[PDB]
């Protein structure tokens with residue numbers, strides 16, 4: 529998960545390193561009921 | 574949230590409830606970005622015409638919740654505010670441009686399976702995902718409809734609501750209303766002929782519009798529920814504060830008041 533750190537923990541506090549990874553889903557390799565709906569819409573060109 | 578569904582437990586662990594102390598009432602949504610910083614909409618904190626001109630001491634935030642009213646023992650956490658920061662260019666007298674604000678918690682919140690921060694977008698994630706047709710997700714405890722009959726009808730959800738919605742082309746957003754739209758705003762929702770529907774509504778402001786990066790599997794907050802004309806109206810769309818475009822302000826406030 530190549531995430532680029534942007535804030536300074538001294539002023540931001542803890543949490544940025546593991547941001548956006550949900551304990552009950554991504555952390556356990558489980559998908560919620562409708563996220564596939566989102567991912568399938570990110571096509572491009 | 575209109576035409577949405579009940580959220581799964583822990584589906585949106587960065588969800589935050591903005592509460593007024595006296596009288597005790599739910600004001601807006603917000604989002605957790607760190608153990609001590611919370612993001613929300615400016616008009617939720619300052620809009621004199623609609624009884625809103627709060628100070629750090631008039632408010633409280635509840636984190637890790639699911640039920641709108643039920644106290645969830647040893648799961649939800651309540652935090653007081655140390656300081657509120659409103660965008661300097663936000664001017665309620667003219668419009669809702671730059672509808673963004675930051676709230677610093679008196680003390681850091683502890684993370685759990687139900688409390689976790691969301692990420693803020695970098696420029697490549699922003700360029701990659703902010704495209705018409707791409708779907709984002711909006712969550713909140715706001716109203717389920719524009720109006721209802723008090724007590725007999727039901728306009729307030731029992732638990733957190735969620736709805737996935739597609740980003741709409743700017744020209745389409747602009748032609749949908751006479752209200753002046755700025756680059757600090759983006760809109761989303763289904764088109765009238767799509768048949769599918771959904772939208773945010775009163776009480777959802779300050780809540781996040783998120784997207785999941787297909788590049789690193791992380792959830793990013795691209796927008797903040799800001800305003801709309803009615804709720805879930807054909808030919809109308811919900812408007813959101815453009816988070817990436819105001820990221821420089823977020824940065825400035827933080828290494829200047831974070832400690």
Ligand SMILES: *[C@H]1O[C@H](CO)[C@@H](O)[C@H](O)[C@H]1NC(C)=O
Nearest residue numbers: 619620621622624625626627
């Ligand atoms: C908030 O208070 C009033 C309305 O209550 C508002 O007009 C003003 O801009 C804000 N600050 C004060 C108290 O002047």
Ligand code: NA
Nearest residue numbers: 805806807809
């Ligand atoms: Na609509």
